[PDB]
């Protein structure tokens, strides 16, 4: 019973899971964009890239320890936005729309 069957293993185990570092929201036009870019809300970007923010903040020495990094991110000072801007430069994100019919979804 543990091996066989849907509820047990394979049929459910390695078939369709919820992943991390992901978000969802409504889409909007943004004509001024370049073809290879996309407008991303500040708050979502901060939430997604949180651990990157902590790592870079600690690397720059702005924070002694990780808890201080959390406190500085929850205050949201100018340094946090500067570090976020710095990490985002070339980092690409994946966009998906619910019915992914073909590979261009």
């Amino acid at each position: 019973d543990m091996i066989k069957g849907k509820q047990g293993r394979f049929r459910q185990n390695l078939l369709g899971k919820r992943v991390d570092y992901s978000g969802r929201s409504v889409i909007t036009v943004g004509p001024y964009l370049r073809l290879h870019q996309c407008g991303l809300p500040k708050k979502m970007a901060l939430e997604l890239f949180k651990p990157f923010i902590y790592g870079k903040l600690e690397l720059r020495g702005l924070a002694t320890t990780i808890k201080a990094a959390k406190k500085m991110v929850e205050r949201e000072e100018a340094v946090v936005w500067d570090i976020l801007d710095e990490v985002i430069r070339e980092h690409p994100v994946l966009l998906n729309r619910a019915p992914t019919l073909h590979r261009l979804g």
Binding site: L35, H36, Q37, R89, E90, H91
Partner: protein, 69 residues
């Protein structure tokens, strides 16, 4: 941002092991064992490694010779 990798795939026509050699190079670059051979323009290390590949300085064989050296 480097919007097209077409010249890098023209260097190695498989277009797949391109990703592998670029990943090895960018991993040698991030964990600071090595140094970039191209002047960086505030790019991250992925686009740096692609920019290096498209200029012909790095491939798999150069990686192998430099590693054994």
């Amino acid at each position: 941002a480097r919007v097209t990798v077409q010249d890098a795939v023209e260097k190695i026509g498989n277009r797949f092991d391109l990703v592998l050699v670029a990943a090895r190079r960018a991993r040698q670059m991030q964990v600071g064992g090595k140094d970039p051979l191209v002047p960086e323009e505030n790019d991250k290390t992925t686009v740096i490694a692609l920019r290096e590949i498209e200029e012909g300085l790095i491939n798999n064989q150069i990686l192998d010779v430099r590693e054994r050296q």
